Every structure is written in structure tokens, then in C-alpha cells.
Design an enzyme around this catalytic site. Sequence first.
Site, short mmCIF file in Angstrom:
data_model
loop_
_atom_site.label_atom_id
_atom_site.label_comp_id
_atom_site.label_asym_id
_atom_site.label_seq_id
_atom_site.Cartn_x
_atom_site.Cartn_y
_atom_site.Cartn_z
N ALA L 72 0.88 -0.86 -0.08
CA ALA L 72 -0.06 0.02 0.09
C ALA L 72 0.87 1.10 0.18
O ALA L 72 1.77 1.29 1.14
CB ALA L 72 -1.03 -0.01 1.22
N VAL L 115 -4.19 4.45 6.39
CA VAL L 115 -4.38 5.45 5.63
C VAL L 115 -3.12 6.21 5.09
O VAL L 115 -2.30 6.06 6.02
CB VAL L 115 -5.25 6.80 6.39
CG1 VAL L 115 -5.29 8.21 5.77
CG2 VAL L 115 -6.44 6.42 6.59
N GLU L 116 -2.95 6.45 4.01
CA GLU L 116 -1.66 7.10 3.40
C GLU L 116 -1.90 8.39 2.77
O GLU L 116 -2.86 8.51 1.89
CB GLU L 116 -0.95 6.15 2.66
CG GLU L 116 -0.44 4.70 3.31
CD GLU L 116 0.09 4.01 2.29
OE1 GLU L 116 -0.68 3.71 1.40
OE2 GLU L 116 1.47 3.81 2.43
N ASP L 117 -1.02 9.18 2.83
CA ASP L 117 -1.24 10.62 2.12
C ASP L 117 0.17 11.04 2.12
O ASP L 117 1.17 10.74 2.60
CB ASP L 117 -2.05 11.52 2.85
CG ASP L 117 -2.59 12.63 1.76
OD1 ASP L 117 -3.06 13.52 2.43
OD2 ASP L 117 -2.23 12.56 0.84
N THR L 177 5.30 6.60 1.37
CA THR L 177 4.56 6.05 2.48
C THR L 177 4.11 4.64 1.93
O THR L 177 3.58 4.65 0.79
CB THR L 177 3.28 6.90 2.73
OG1 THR L 177 2.69 6.41 3.91
CG2 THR L 177 2.57 7.19 1.78
#
Lengths: 66, 66, 66, 66, 66, 66, 229, 229, 229, 229, 229, 229
Positions: L72, L115-117, L177
Site C-alpha cells: 500500500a 490511511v496514507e497521504d 509512505t
Amino acid sequence: SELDAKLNKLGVDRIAISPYKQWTRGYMEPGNIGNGYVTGLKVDAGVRRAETKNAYIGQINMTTAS
Amino acid sequence: SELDAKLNKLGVDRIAISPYKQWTRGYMEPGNIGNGYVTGLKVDAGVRRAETKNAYIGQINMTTAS
Amino acid sequence: SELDAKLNKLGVDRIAISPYKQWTRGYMEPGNIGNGYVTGLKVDAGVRRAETKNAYIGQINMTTAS
Amino acid sequence: SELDAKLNKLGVDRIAISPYKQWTRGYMEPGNIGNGYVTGLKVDAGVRRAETKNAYIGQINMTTAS
Amino acid sequence: SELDAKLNKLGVDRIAISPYKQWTRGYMEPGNIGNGYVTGLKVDAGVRRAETKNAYIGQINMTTAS
Amino acid sequence: SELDAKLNKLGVDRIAISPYKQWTRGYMEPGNIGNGYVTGLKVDAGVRRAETKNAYIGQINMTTAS
Amino acid sequence: XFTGVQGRVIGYDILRSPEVDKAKPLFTETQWDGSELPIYDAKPLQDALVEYFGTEQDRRHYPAPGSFIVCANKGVTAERPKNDADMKPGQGYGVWSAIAISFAKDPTKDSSMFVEDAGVWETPNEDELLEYLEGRRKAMAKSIAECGQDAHASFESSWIGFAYTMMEPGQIGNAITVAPYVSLPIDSIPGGSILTPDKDMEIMENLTMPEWLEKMGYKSLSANNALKY
Amino acid sequence: XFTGVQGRVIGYDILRSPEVDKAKPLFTETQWDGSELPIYDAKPLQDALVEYFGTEQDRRHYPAPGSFIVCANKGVTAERPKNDADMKPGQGYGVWSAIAISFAKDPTKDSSMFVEDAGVWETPNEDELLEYLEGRRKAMAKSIAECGQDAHASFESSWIGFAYTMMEPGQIGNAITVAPYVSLPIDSIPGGSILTPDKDMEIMENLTMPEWLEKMGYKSLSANNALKY
Amino acid sequence: XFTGVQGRVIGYDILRSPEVDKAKPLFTETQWDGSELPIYDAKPLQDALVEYFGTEQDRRHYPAPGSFIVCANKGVTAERPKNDADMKPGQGYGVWSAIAISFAKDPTKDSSMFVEDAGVWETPNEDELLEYLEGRRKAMAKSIAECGQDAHASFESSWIGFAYTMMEPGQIGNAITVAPYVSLPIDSIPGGSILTPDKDMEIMENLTMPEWLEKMGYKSLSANNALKY
Amino acid sequence: XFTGVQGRVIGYDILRSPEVDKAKPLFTETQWDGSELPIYDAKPLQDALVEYFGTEQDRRHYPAPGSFIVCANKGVTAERPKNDADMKPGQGYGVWSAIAISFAKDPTKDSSMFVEDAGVWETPNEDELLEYLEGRRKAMAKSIAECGQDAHASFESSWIGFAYTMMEPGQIGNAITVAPYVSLPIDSIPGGSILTPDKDMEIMENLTMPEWLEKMGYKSLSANNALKY
Amino acid sequence: XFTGVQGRVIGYDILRSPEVDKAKPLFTETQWDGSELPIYDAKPLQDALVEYFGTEQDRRHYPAPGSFIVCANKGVTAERPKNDADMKPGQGYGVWSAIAISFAKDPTKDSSMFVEDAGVWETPNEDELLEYLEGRRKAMAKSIAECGQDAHASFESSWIGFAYTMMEPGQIGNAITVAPYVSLPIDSIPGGSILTPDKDMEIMENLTMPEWLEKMGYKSLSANNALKY
Amino acid sequence: XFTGVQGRVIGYDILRSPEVDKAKPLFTETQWDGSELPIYDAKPLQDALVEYFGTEQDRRHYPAPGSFIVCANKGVTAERPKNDADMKPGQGYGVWSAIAISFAKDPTKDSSMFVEDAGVWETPNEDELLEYLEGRRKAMAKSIAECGQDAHASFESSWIGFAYTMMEPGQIGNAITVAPYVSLPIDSIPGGSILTPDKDMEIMENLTMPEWLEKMGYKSLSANNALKY
């Protein structure tokens, strides 16, 4: 066959496939597909041999079950 | 070996590998790799035992093929 | 068990699981999980049968190890 | 190839066989034999298509590695 | 289905079973039985989500095929 | 872990072993033992690279899950 | 042995011959729980095995050369010396073997059983032998019916078959009774594939013997009583 | 048993000893189809097995403690009482066992066969025994040649080996004939890996025995006739 | 047989009964390397097997109907005729069987061994029989201690068990000695799963018999000496 | 994209809904080889997927939490600002997505194809959007018919489905087109077992959707057009 | 990206074309550790892939219809409008793609890398494009040599290949760079069997391309520069 | 994204660092069902991954060269030109990435989410950036708490981590990330064997990070805040 459904619910399956061309193989031999066995009846008497009369159980290694 | 090629086309393979360190295992034992077997010849006579003379077939469980 | 660790380093494992519900199966039968076996001791004498006294070794096909 | 021997001692093997007749399959697809992959190089440019010019990468689903 | 017979002769099978209770799994995931896949069609539009409307494709990790 | 017991009753297992010496492998790669995955968290920022700072995610092919 | 939860019998469970359906019981011995256990001549089932493996001169799906087939087997060898009279303790004038498969009422709980026996025959009277064997058939029929009580197995039919040879002077006779436990090759299942294992068994469970011979292009070796035992 | 389509024999198919190539036939009995079947002393093949498993004091790739090895085996035990004369019915002065492996001409169609026998010896005459055994060797040579006709198996060589012990008074002799069916460990194949199974067999199929001993750093227990049977 | 590197014994290695811990040796025969090999009555281990498989009327994890269980087994059948006196050569008044499992000191190098024997008894004297059997126990104890030298196996305990029946006139006795090699069902391991194989064995290796009975809701068939052999 | 030799489509190949049989083509674009390729509304097939996975409030065989499902997917997100007029370059008043699955004439040689597209809509005129979408349906119908020539794939039907949402001011719309590639759970096949894999697919290949709902005791979420997209 | 410890490259590791041996480096950029990294035109390797998969009109071992092939791929699509001049921001007069595979010095420790790039071309000057591409080749050659330092990977050769199309007005050009990761079919390995997996790779690792074409009866599509990219 | 029923997280589920136990929440946003969802700095979990894979100069269980690791991942690259001012549309003065793993309350029913940003930063004010990031942390904390309602997932903690670099003029910054999904090597589990798979995970599930470092003879790269991100 209803039996196989009942049987499969217990973990048992009667599948017994041989990977070879033409030839049958024996129960518990490596490479067979399935966890079952198929059996048959041979009684034969010969003189001079018995094993080669009628149903040919060829050049086979048999182990005895009792 | 041409034989193995001819054999493989029929579904037969002569592979027989033991997963163990040092030790051989017997045909049809779980965990072996391959669908074949390797055999040898032992005749020995001893007195007081025979099995421990010359080729050591150790503390083994044998089943008879006939 | 330290033994199993020592054993596993040699390639040996004592695992022996039966896929069936309720029933045990025999060593080297297809579908078992593991490369080991579990054994026990039965001596029983009966008259009129012995096999059905005490530890029930049911309608089983036995092969002899020697 | 000495490389494969060195590789196999680490647990790695480069075997990648497809069970299908004629067709290649992709790495990680179920039923392949082996734990390796074989790759090649295709650069092609077409106009009006590119994928069907020269090396036919047929009606394939591709996923991108980066 | 005649198709499966024709297909099986080429090495292809469309079997795709999930080992889980209730849940489907995705193609190429370890532990699935079979070398095939089953697909379906979902188009949905939502506002404030789309993925949770109508056919629930749950809390899933998707990878894109193109 | 009670969780694994609850999980196993549903058909799910979290086992994920790599056959290689030293190296981890990725989920769904052939030859892995188990039907699970282990994950971790890497955020890193570098300048001139980011991937080689701190947790080494080596010369890897990644595919994106979303 | 026994064939149980994992097994099928050639000629009854798979490749069933219409003779299995034609067959009249020879008689029905009363098995312990009250049921009458019909007894039938197993020559249908026997003919079915010959069909599947074939014969030494028209070999079909015979077990692979060098394989290990676990068998429930007994067998006897006896000699007749050149015309001698008070012959040696392991000699006789004739020899015989027998087999009986008995199908369990509930194959999910109890197993099906094989009884096998064989022996030598001392008198030269072929007519005496034959009668002893019908006597012995009737005997086996009873032991079964009885011994099932001990493990409380209830059966629904028993199929008993015999085979015999009289020796001429200076000839040895061999008589065997064997039930093999095997797995089946793909070119034996019409429509069968190595990829469809479970259906493969179902195909064989549904084809009759005559159907199977036609489909495979094989000449029915049973023919009309072509096989003698 | 039989070794057939799935098997190899230590010392002939794998790890072949140059003695297999040095070996002159003892004589050639005519097998039924017209071929002359050379007969050879199997002491090469026997020496090869001792090399691979090792001996009780220099153990090499012996079968794992507690394993199940299916064997083609026969064996006889007999006693000699303290000097008694008209000794009990299962006693004698000597004991012997024998084995013969015969390689099939076409191993894709027919299997290779083992003949094994063993018995006790009644006279105290060691010189009589030895001659009876050459007589018995010659006997086995013939049964093979004959009995192959029945299944129409044609062979190309037979390798027969014998072993014997005379008992002194008040000592029991045991004599065994055994052919084991095993699978081979990786640290036995130089260059072998658990990951290269099929090539592993090919390695062993190509190394000769002396090569294998050198590669493994093992002292040739055959040496020059170091092993007596 | 032998149980070796791949095996466990019900009642000692797995599901160990506190009686295994309560047990006093009957006596200790000196085994060849100097160690004293304690000898114990195997009725703990025997009771443990009955617990796991159950009995014909309260069946628990018995082997599957029709399965193939490889067994180390011997067994004897003998008749007592209706009151006859100089009875036929294979008849007697009583019958017996015996088993001994001996645990190897180092199960990574040597295997553990089973000795099994059985025979018929000729006198009608039950009191004579019993003493002969203690004599025979003491005998087996010694053969073990001795024969271990030959393969240089050193053990640490031997557990010997016996079973016997006297026939009344016109009754046949059967006596069997059997050690089965099996694999265990999941609904036998509390907390066990088909998905956790290796831990499954560890669970059974750690539960004691009383613990296992409680966990499974099974009534201890050992009770206080409820089982006679 | 593609589903080919290894695949089946829910609602057409497996669990086929009678509506697939009721369905009249919208029109038939002429595909390159001369065949007329009927075009159909995929709302049957779409309804079938909803039936099998269920909905967020009546969840059925949805993909396992945390699994990796490879999907052929495209999807678009667009915003409508609070009443603004010459809005930012990635905003609009509506949003749409589309999918088309086209079944190959010969699935042993050619694959079946998925076309997926999605976009944003600039005008606030819902009636304009809808017509553009029928225009776009007709457009996709043609590209398919054409582009099949390039790989010489011939199809026999194409099933196209659309979904759309108009945003109100200050709301974001998301529209997705996804075709998942999954494997099926056993408690989804009536009569299915983990032990009968190939037959399992055949069961699903033969049950119709209404049959499956009855058998499973599930309420037909298609009902009579209960589902809007 | 990467092909590493588990992989082979068609035309270099397997099915190597004699041109890989004929090939002169274009020049050698100095990679960080002091080694000179020869750079070569990958048109050998590219020709090799075409040989193995075949072409749309003479299809050979192409990936199965509907399969999932993970690819390292990049690709660009650009349009040239009907004769327009200050054309839209995603249009141009030509298009190009490139690939470079660089073989690691030690494939047991480091991986081999793929560099792939592609872009559009703005001027209509084909002669300008071509020179930019040699400039870009030389550019990639350097980035490789540099960036290897960061993970301290040392390579021994890099093989770079390019492909391009100029659009005529009112035509769209597509250019793709793809490296697939596949597994090989048995009817591709002369002498190969599904039963000999590891040897199968060794066969392909030893056959040269011309050898493979003869053995398979396939016409060398490379011929003498028959393929243009 | 998601890690669900099949997964574990390095540093929380396996190899848990005592810091996970030392850790005070930064604050707790109220998630929809009433529960307060504590938010924590994921720098424990992040430090744990570095421990297991190692660093480019002290490499430990890093993913195999050339492997396919599904991740991810999101990541951003931005340039700062040589001192220019109104810089090009994809340039800035700094760059940042973030990750948050949120553990589900019931992992048998719901999955755990990532959650990745990541984004670029326009001003040169490092102090502005840092505050925006705490603002963004607080932002992610809320979206999670909200969006869980839509699939009715309830979590129990969220661990958020950030990483950033300011560029100097004429330098490019890359920020990534990534959460990898891997399987673990045997020489990583003290006491682990390829033969004990399920127990292997249990060993790792029970060892703490300091324990694992001692057992493996590895120097704690976390040390006391030795790692900066």
C-alpha cells in the site's frame, strides 16, 4: 451419490485416480489423486500361473492386509 | 537417460528423495519427494544379528512384499 | 519439547493428523497431515472377538510390520 | 549452472513452468510449477495496436510493478 | 459443460474455491483451491461511499488490472 | 492467541513463512508457507533514495494496493 | 479384509453389470438383527474385474509393472506326485479358493467385509469336491451372519465366488483369492480428466459395464459366460 | 518381488561399480524366446548396497530409526543343539539365503524381478552345502528363464548372490534375503538439492561408485573383497 | 517392531496418565552398557489406549471403518475340544499374548522397540500359567537388555504387559498383541485445528489423560482398575 | 480488461438469472467478420453480483476483510463547489461510470473482454447527461466491434451497464466501475464440499439465481427492479 | 523494475541468441565502483522475445487469453490533430518508448534492474527525434551507473532498446515498454516434461535460439533484421 | 488500504516494542459509535520495521532482490529550482508523507485500515510545514473516525506517523509512505523451523523486540531515538 455427500461431511472422500497412462496403481502410492480406493474380486485356480489367468494382476508387488 | 523420457511420457517418474539428513526412508512414506523407489540386494547370514552384519538395515520396521 | 526441535533440525517431524471427524487413520494413508505416527499398546484375549474387547480396533485392515 | 546451485542453497529456485498447452502464464498464477519467473523485453510503437505488433502479448490482463 | 472438457484437455480448469466461511477471496491468494477465477460487474455512483452502495465490496485491498 | 483460534474456525490462518535464507518475500509469492501476511509501516523522506533510507526495502518490485 | 468408507467395488458400485440386477439370490441366511441376508454368486463381480484389468493376452487397465498393490489375499499350492498313493502331508488331488464380499447396510458407520479362504482337496473325486464347496459356501454364509453381531455390523447382501482345479498326476495346482485396492487411470473414464477427480469417480459410478465397453471400444470379455474359474 | 517402471537398483542403475562392467557371466541359461540370459554373481550389486548404507560401526545412509521400509524379504532361523544327534525337526547344522535380481529387456512394458529363497542345511558337511548352493543357483537360473514365459517377460541378465553360515554345536544361525524399497537423502547426492529432485536422480545415475566415494570422502568398504557374506 | 524418530506413544509421550508417574518398577535388569533398565507393568499405557479409542459399546477415536492401519501384531488362536484328553497338536487349555515397549535413551539416534509374543498353554492349571508368564516377563526383560548391544541401543525403561484366557471345554481362545501406527483426528485435540498441525501434537503432548477426559466430557474408562486384560 | 480461459461471470456462466434469457438486445452493431454483435443492458449481470455479495446492511458472500482482490477498475471523483460558477478545472455538476463485458465466440481460443470508462459531467442538465450516456453506450458498442479485428477476436453479445449521480451544490460525487476476480466459498454451493471442487463449480454453473436464493434461504434483492444504479 | 534471484531473461539466460555473443558494445559508462559498464543495443534480446511469443499472425507461446501477467510497463499515447498548429497540451508529432535491462555482477546478492521510460515528441523533425533518443540512451546509461551506488549494486552490462513512431496528421501513436514475468509451457522445452521441472529450465538455459527453432520446427522470425521497432 | 483477518503488524502484533506499552495517546477523537479512538504517534511501529529489515548499511531481513512485494504505497517527488521564484507548477520548497494504521475492535468481522497521504509544500517556512502536519494529523484522525461509520467499522487505536524534508535550492525531495505485505524467513524466528509454521508465528507473536534483538545478536537500531524520519 447421496452416500458421497454424507461421507464428505465426515472428511471422507472415495476419490482414487492414478496418474499413469493405461495402468492402475495401488492405494497409498505417491502421486495418486484422492484419498480413497477401489477394490474388486479375483478368485482363480490354475495348474502346471493362477495370477495370470483371467484378470491380469501383472508383475505386481503385493502386500497382505488381514 | 532415454528410459526416463519414455517413462515420463506414460506418467511414470523414478524420483525418490528423502527429506531427512543422512537417512534413507522407505517407499510410500509421507514427505518423500517423487513417485519412485530405489532398491538394492542384501543377503547375509550370521550366528550367535544377520540384519546388522554388513549393510546396516538399522532399527527398521519392515513390511513384506510378495 | 526440546526433542522435537532437535528432531526438526534433522528433517524429522512427529506430526500426524487425520482429516476425519472422530476417526483415527493409519500411518502412510493419503490425506493425513504430517510425517509422523502415533502408536499405542493393545494386548487382549477373548474366547468364544479379542479385537473388539477393550480398545476397539474396529473394522480395520491391518498390515504387519516386523 | 553454478548459479542455480548457489541459489538453491539459499532456498531460491528459478523454476517456472506453465501447466497449459502452448500458452505461457504469469508469475504467481495458481497451478504453475516452480517458484521463479522468466522475463523478456518488449518495446514497440504503433499508430492508427502497439501490444499486437511484433511480440504478441495477447488478450492479457497486466498489473504494474514499479 | 462441454467447454470445461475442451478446456481441461489444454491444461486449463476454471475451478476457484475459497477456503473461508462466508467470504470470497481473490484470485491468486494462497490457500484457494483451483486454478481459475470468477468475475462480476459492478458500476455504482454515490455522493456525499460508491464501493459500499449495492454490491458490498467490503474492506478490500484492490490491485488494478489493465 | 485466542484470535487465531477464532480465526482458524472460519478457515482463516495468519501464517506467512518465507522459504529463503535471510530474506522476506511478498504475499502471494509461490513457495511461501501459509495463507497470511505480515505488514509494517514505512514513511521516509530523502533528497538529492527515500526507499533506501532507514528500513531497507531493497531492490524490490512493488505492486500497488488501494 | 475390509473395504469401508473410502471404497467402491468394481461391478457393484462402479461399472455395475446388468447381471447384478438380473441376479437371483441362492438363499438368504438370517443375520442376527433379524434381517435376512441374501447370498448371491459373485461371478458378476468377478467378471467385472476381468473386464477392467483385461487378460494376459488382451491387457487393459492392469496394475503398473512393479507397483505396490495392497491386497487382501490368501492362496494355496499343492502337488499331486507321479501316481503315488499314500502321498506326502502337503499334497492332494485338487485345490480350491473362495471369496465373499458383503455390503454393509450403513457404509457411513460400518465397513463392508471380505471373507477369503482356500484349501487343498484330498480325494480324487471331483464330484465330492464340488459338493463340499457348496457346503462350504453355505458355511461362510453363516459365519458372516454370525460374526457380524460381535461388531454389530448389519449387511444387506453377500456375494460369494469359488474357483478350483483338479490336478492330473505329477502336476501342481495353485489357487488364489485376492481383492486389490487400487486407484483408476484417466484413460478409463470417458470424459474424465486429471483435472476433474471427483467427477471422474461419479462417471464410473454411473456408467454400466456395457456402456463402458462401447464407449472404450472394448470387446466384452464376459460375453455370455466366456470366463470359467 | 518386483522392481519396475518406478525403480532403480543400487549398483546397476545408480552408483554403478566398475565391477559391473568387469563381470564375466558364470553361464547363460536359454530363456524361452530364444535369448541367452547371462547369469552373473551379484556380489558387485551386494557390495554396492553395503557402500551406500554403511556398516553398524561406520554407518552411512542407513534407513531412519523407526521408519517403515517395505522389503521383499525371506529369512530362516535354525538351531544346532549341544551336540545332540537325531535333532528336533527344525534344527540343522547350517543355514543359507539367496537372492537374484533379473533386469527386464523392456522396462517400459515389463518389470524386473527378484527371486529370493532360503533354507536350512541338515548335514554337517560344509563342502556338501556349497555344492548344493551352486546347484541351487543353477536351479534358480532355470526357473526364472522358464516362468518368464508365463507373463512373456524377456530379461537380459540375472545377478544371483548367496550367503551362508555353518553353526558350531549349541549356536543358532539366522540367514536373511532382503531387497528394500527406499528414497534417497540429499547429503548423498553431490550437487544435489531438495529443490532439484529429478536432476538428483540423474546425478546418482551418472556417478560411478568410486567417484561417489571420493566426492563424499568415504572409504570404499568393498576395498578388494573386504566383504564376506 | 519399532517406533522411532517420527513417533509418540499414547499414555507416555502424549496424554500421559499420572499412573506413569505413580509407577514403581517391578525390577531392573542390567542392560549391557552398565545402565539398569527398570521394567514396569505396561497396564498404564494399555489403559491409555482404551481411553483414546474407546470400547465397542462406547466408541471414541477408533480407526476409521475400512482403513489401512499398519500394526506390529502377533496373535494366537487355540481350541479346547469337548472334554477330549490327548487333544490334537494345535489345541490346549489356555492362551496368552504379551507386549513390551522399551523407550530409547536417545530417540534422535536410536529407536524405541516393541517386543511382542504369544503362545498357547497346554496344562489346565491357571496357577501354572500365571507363573510361567511372570517367568516369561522376566525372560523378555533379559532378551531386550541383551539384544540391544547388537545395535548398541541403550534404553531407559521397558513397560511389559500380558493378557490371557483359559478356555472352558469346547471353546476357542484368541489372544492378540498389537501396536497400531495412526494419525490423530482434530476433535481429539481441545483447541486443535486442521490449520495448526504442529501445535496440535504439542497440545496432546502436554495434556494429561484426566485433563483430556474432562476437556472432552469423557468418562474415564480406566476408572480404578475397571479394565481387565 | 479480460476474463478468459479460466473464468466464469456471475449471472451469465454461473447463477444465470432468467432475465438473461428474457433480455432483448438494445441493437446489434456489425462486428468486423460479418457477425452482428447484439448489445444488451448489463443490468441483469449487475443485479446478479449484488445478489451474491449482498449489501452493506444484508451482507452475503462479500470478499474477506483485508483480502487482496485484483480488479479491473476505473473510478472518478468530482466536486461541485458551494454554488460557484466558473468552477475549478476538476469539478463539475455530475459524474458517471460504465462497464461492458463482451463474451467471446470461442473461449478456448480468444478471451472475453471488459471495457470500463468513467468521467465527469460539466453541464447541470441531467437530461443532457443521460442522452450523452446513451450516445456513449452506442460509442463503446462500436469501439468493441472495431478493435476486436486487431486481435481477430469475434464475440457473440456485449452487455453494457452505466451508473450516474448528479451532485447538489457543495457535494462530491464518486462513480466506480469494477470487475473483481474472486474464488467462491463452500457455504455458497448447496451440496458443495471443500472435497468436491470441480463439481462445486458445476453446481453453480447449473443453478439459476432464483433456485440459488431459495436453496440458501435468501431474499431476492433484485426483487422487481429494487436496485438502482 | 527488477528481475533478481528467481529469474531468467529470454535471449540472455535462456535461448541465448548467437548475436548476444556477436554484440559489440556501443560504449562503456564508468560505474561508480571503478568497473566500466559496457552498454549494448538490446535488439538481440528484443528479437528473442518475438521469437518465443510469436506474432499476431504466427502466434507461438503467447500468454494465455485472460491471464494475469504482472509486467514492468510504461506506455504513452499522443495524437496529432488534422493539420492544426499550436496543438492541444497532450499532442505532438511523434512518440517513443525505451527499455534497458542491466545484469547484476552478483545475482545471489543483488538484483538485475530494468529502466523503462517513454514520452511524446513535439517537433515534426524525425531526424531531431532520433538524435534526442541517442542522447537519451546515453542519459539512461549514466543514471544507471550512478543510482547503482545508492544500493551499491554493481552490474556488468546494460542492454538498452528504443522504439518510435512519427504520426501523420490526424493519427494517434501509442508506444509501450513492457517486461513480462511469465512461466513457460512444456511444449516449448524439447525433451521437457511436466514431470522434470528443474531439468526443463536447464534445457532452455542450454539451447541457443537457432537450436530451439530447428528443434521446434519454427521459422526464425529474426531472420536477418526482419523485425523493426 | 487494509490488513485484516490474515495479518499481523510488526511492532504491535509481533515483536511488540515496550514503547507500544509506554505510549501515551496524543489525543482521542470520538468515533461515531460513541467510543473514543485514542490517536498515537506511530514512531514505535515505524522503529520496529527498521529493526526487522535493517538499514542499507546493516541489512537484516530485507525483501529478497527481485521479489514482488505488494505494497500500500503513495509517494511524491518535487524539485526546488536554482533559486528561482515564481517556480514551475510541480515544484516547491519542501515535501511530506504520512501513514496511519488503525486497529479494528473485532478483527474477525472487520479489517484494520491504513490511511496514507503525501504532498508537496509551497512556502520555505519549515515552521509552517510542521504545524500544517500536526493540523493534517488531527485531520486524518477525524476522517478515520467518520468514514468508519460507512462500513460500520469500530477501531480501538490509530497510530499516525509523518516524515518530511525541506529542499535546499536546486535539490529534489522524494517522500514515500509504504506498508508492505510480506512473509517471514526462518532465521528470524529463534526456535523456528520450516517444519513448525504455525508455531513460528506464535514465537514472533510472543517475543518482544528487545528479546528478539538479544536472541538474534542484533544491535537495537532504535537505540534511544537513533532514527529520524
